[PDB]
Design brief:
homopentamer, alpha/beta, Nucleotidyltransferase, domain 5, six-stranded mixed β-sheet, 9 helices, about 30% helix, binds guanosine-5'-triphosphate, cell cycle
């Protein structure tokens, strides 16, 4: 029957199915008087509002109340008439060792919710769990997988690397660095200029032209990440597919790099689960 | 059919419809011999005179006989020939959790009154309830909502803050501080000068030139409110729309602030329900 | 030395000391030819007759010539041989902010009077001022103050509520409703039956059987007061002590209520200053 | 010279010095007519009454007018003859990052107050700030710190965990769960039974026998907290010291647990600052 | 001038100089609110806390942020008044091919740090790099180096073997086996007994008597390591010096072996850099 794919992401939860899209992993459970003015869900004795509050930073999100965001994203991907669906969840690569913990709350059960009053329940056909970032592989045709590839997801705080040969994997790694670190570095001196910004509001300010982050600072970040990744891979080799939002930060200068074969694929942020959807096709079809 | 908007306000009830305007939330039910000389309404076994008496200070006005002022304002907004009307009531933000209590007396019923002898009854088409101060949002065009905004209502005893991103809310808060507190502070030493004034008569005395409240005291109040609001928002960010009467107190020096983008919108006191009227247009139209 | 307690009440002045009792707060200063036939006092350039005239309704009785009734009650509580006495006056709860005004005429002075010719003067040992209705607390033993309590004085036009935990207060409030309002409601249709009664003569007529106020109307008043008081207190909780004359109106059906723990204490009308006398014992002894 | 310790707590402020004790963090600043009947303090342009009003729930109490309760507790711990004192304040663990904000109002200054009229001022010798819950450590002798320990404070809405090896810390964490949540869960169905209770009055009702919360519900809460805490610690390991009021809720069944080494220490609620006092001894002595 | 020796070890960093000692290689860079309660260093844009967090297991520690622990150990070995020092670093034997990478960050430069606020900088006189485990050689006198020797370091996950003839080396090898593997084997069935232990906490539990690892299991590990090492060396020949912490695990039964000449030297864990210090004496003196 019908299938959906869900990416829990590093800062944004995201979904594809009969309904497709994304939203921030942002969450709150604090004081309230105007519930109607916020996206909200109450279930399992927990009340939450979605897309606002605190973003959190603790490792292994699977252990700190991910459930509300997960079910909210499921409701988004689904329509009110959905009977039952298959599940292809995704986790940050180095974290899938926690899948069993997820299996505690997830494996082949049925779930109830309210989410503003739509408030129905649904069972899941089956369960698969995959690495975040990696799935990009299956969105690719043989157009470039005819040669060796490197899926490279520039996640908010991380870079997720998996180098693959014919049909198969060759190596994997994670580096704890990301555009959030760049925002922190920028604020280390921009806040010092009599301001009260944060790593969360910053991007909107670069968008509106209120702030003038220098062009060469993005280049500094690019060089830093390249230096970090050198010991494992040759970027010139292993044609690299950039994915994630940070690739959307840096496309304009990634394109300027002297590398041999590479690209920032369209919807690079959602390319991983474009590939996960192709992998789902492979699984069922 | 036709619609009206009503703001219960902090010190003044106010209305817009086929008739528009405002008046103080002031009320009495005390001894009387010249009923004809006072605005008055008798209903539900309660006799009241409007715009005079005691202003009251208790929290949750919804529980201390708001009904007379509400129906009086309805009669003002309506004309004697009105058949039936839709309702868009407003409450102080942190107070809409009491809407259910309001729903006890209000939801889709018909109401009778006397009010000096016009003395007819009317049914209401439907019910919506909204936050006071917030509705300003919908009076704005994309002229400045293209960027992030902050509705900022300097209510008599409070400041009501709601920061909004595209089409949507980002955060909300209230601070229990207002021009009434400034009047109390001024009287803490001005009354001490062998006088018997109050926070109610004071503004008329500054108007007539009888009193000489220093210019820098308004600046002190501005700095106090700015210090109070800092922990949640950056004023330079989130282009701020000042609303409420206190904005009318301080316009002349608000305009002098070093902030980047901001304004005290025309009819700032009634701008919130200018926006509520735009929101009503959005609802029905 | 010896002490007295005085309750100014809502309709009746009242006293306890070497002489104890009560009488209406009724007063006149109008035309006269048979002074000997009326209780009377002339002092401070004011001539008054006690227990007859006009009852008055204005708020803050402390500002409209309470003095004659006060001194008359003092004379009642005292004997002609009294040298000097301590004072424990009482005010309606929300009104003790006017104590300073009372201190203008009262604090530690000596007073002269005539009152039909007894006509002596007396000084007062000291001054304390307490809330009317509340003092009931100290008449109670630990017999029921071992648990949480609620002093509930059903005064002529009001209900005075104070909820107390161990030895201490928890909350307080007033509601402007009373048996006078019930009498007004009854006369709203009973006078309409070609009669000229008032809220003052009515109770005598129910006493003599001339009038047949329905039983269920007292129940309607009970339900109205219960609905009014709900937002602040749980009647089932906070064992309630009914006090005041209206409790004497309603005892027969108060006893029928489904509440858990409660009572209409003996001399409920004077129970408050039974407790004030116990509090005086606590003060001096 | 002399030193004092103050715990701001989650629901109760508390103090030890020449005077020792505790009281609720409850506070009000609302309407008043009988100031003498309430604990009260007026300073810095703010009037407050202590131990009554609203308990508040917002995070980072350091930003919402904690000052009145703090100074009130200082006055309690001190005597009218106190010259100057050292300060060892405490904050909820995850919150001490706000100490700088506290340093804005506190570091080595002198403070004035009224508090019913005692109304003097005092300077502070020095400043230290410590984690709430943790300080229990220093009340322990080597009697059980010879082995690894776990300070475990079951605070009103939280559980505060710090696991310590020889003389030192090993790990720390907070879980947003507490007896307040249990009271909310109990009221989720007990209020539904035609009652108007809250999480605040409930404990008094279990105390008086009016309510019959089932024994197994406390066990359910115990199991829930144990499940929550498992991912970080082994309870059988790291001999656990239960602290806080909730430990006083659950002692009777905590003692029944199958764990190896543990205890609910005497005055578990105040054991943390018993240890903070021992730590003060260590600091100065 | 003065010299220091540093062992990066397998689980513990360690140092000798004007200050001597050791500590775990344990490290974290995660969320924080009580910096003062943890050993910490912030430099080169990286914030870390020492002796707690994650121990890590990846090969070639030189590539995964060893810098914080290294500089922390330098600060330990040095005093606040140190001007400049010589450097004799050590690496796991098979890893010194990475010395050039170390030379990228280390060779004859000056370094800055904060480490809780001491926060000074220092230059290094010169650079030497040596094998971990081997240096034990130079702590020995001719007391037993008159004959052939075998330095044998039973490191946490490894055994490091170097067989030496007169003044010189004869052969070298590493075996990937260690007491960490023994702890993993023990937990393979001890955790299975309804417990949540790890290879890190285990040794403390054997220390406190909570756990009863059988005596013969240490013998099994001894036999396994002996079988592993046989193909290269004769233990009876090449008088063996046991070094490292695991030798401290097994001394009591190592002494029982039927071998001809051998010993577990005092401070076997630090004997290697006792010898490295002797080698430094040889170098400069
Ligand atoms: N320009 C632009 N950037 C975006 C947009 N949405 C997200 N981003 C960027 O995404 C970056 C966050 O890091 P990511 O690369 O997305 O990390 P991640 O692992 O993919 O985590 P997720 O965003 O949840 O998928 C930030 O720098 C954002 O600016 C967008 O709509 N436009
Ligand atoms: N100058 C001037 N000030 C006004 C007028 N009407 C009201 N105000 C001011 O309004 C202030 C009261 O505080 P507000 O900002 O109005 O508080 P609010 O929440 O908006 O409550 P409402 O007045 O009922 O809408 C007082 O300081 C008044 O002086 C006016 O016609 N002229
Ligand atoms: N049955 C009866 N009722 C009385 C008597 N004296 C006073 N009352 C009642 O007292 C009621 C007046 O309201 P109260 O409850 O006394 O109000 P209050 O605040 O106590 O004012 P005071 O009467 O002055 O103490 C009236 O309904 C009277 O009928 C009495 O002797 N017998
Ligand atoms: N039985 C009993 N319980 C108490 C008493 N005082 C407080 N409590 C309990 O304390 C609990 C509140 O949670 P706490 O564990 O105290 O949370 P906290 O972090 O310590 O906050 P504080 O109470 O201010 O110290 C409630 O369940 C109360 O019932 C008491 O005197 N007797
Ligand atoms: N009994 C005891 N054992 C210790 C002590 N310190 C470390 N150890 C042991 O050291 C062992 C770790 O393996 P090692 O032999 O030290 O491996 P390594 O290559 O020397 O790595 P380092 O410990 O960092 O020097 C563990 O089994 C620990 O129990 C100690 O103070 N007492």
């Amino acid at each position: 029957m019908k299938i959906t794919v869900v990416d829990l992401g590093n800062i944004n939860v995201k979904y594809v199915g009969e309904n497709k899209g994304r939203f921030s992993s942002k969450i709150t459970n604090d004081y309230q008087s105007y519930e109607e003015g916020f996206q909200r869900v109450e279930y399992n004795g927990i009340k939450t509002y979605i897309g606002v509050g605190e973003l959190s930073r603790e490792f292994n999100k699977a252990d700190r109340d991910y459930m509300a965001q997960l079910l909210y994203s499921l409701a988004k991907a689904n329509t009110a008439d959905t009977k039952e669906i298959n599940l292809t969840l995704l986790l940050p690569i180095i974290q899938m060792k926690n899948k069993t913990r997820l299996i505690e709350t997830l494996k082949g059960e049925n779930f109830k919710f309210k989410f503003n009053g739509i408030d129905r329940e649904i069972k899941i056909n089956d369960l698969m769990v995959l690495p975040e970032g990696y799935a990009s592989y299956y969105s690719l045709d043989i157009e470039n997988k005819k040669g060796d590839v490197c899926i490279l997801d520039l996640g908010s705080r991380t870079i997720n690397i998996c180098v693959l040969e014919n049909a198969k994997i060759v190596k994997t790694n994670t580096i704890k660095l990301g555009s959030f670190d760049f925002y922190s570095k920028i604020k280390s001196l921009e806040n010092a200029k009599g301001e009260d910004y944060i790593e969360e509001d910053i991007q909107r300010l670069i968008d509106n032209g209120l702030i003038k982050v220098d062009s060469k600072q993005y280049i500094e970040f690019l060089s830093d990440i390249l230096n970090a990744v050198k010991p494992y891979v040759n970027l010139k080799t292993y044609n690299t597919i950039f994915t994630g939002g940070t690739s959307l930060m840096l496309k304009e200068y990634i394109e300027k790099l002297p590398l041999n074969k590479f690209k920032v694929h369209p919807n690079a942020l959602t390319s991983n689960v474009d590939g996960a959807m192709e992998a789902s096709k492979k699984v069922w079809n």
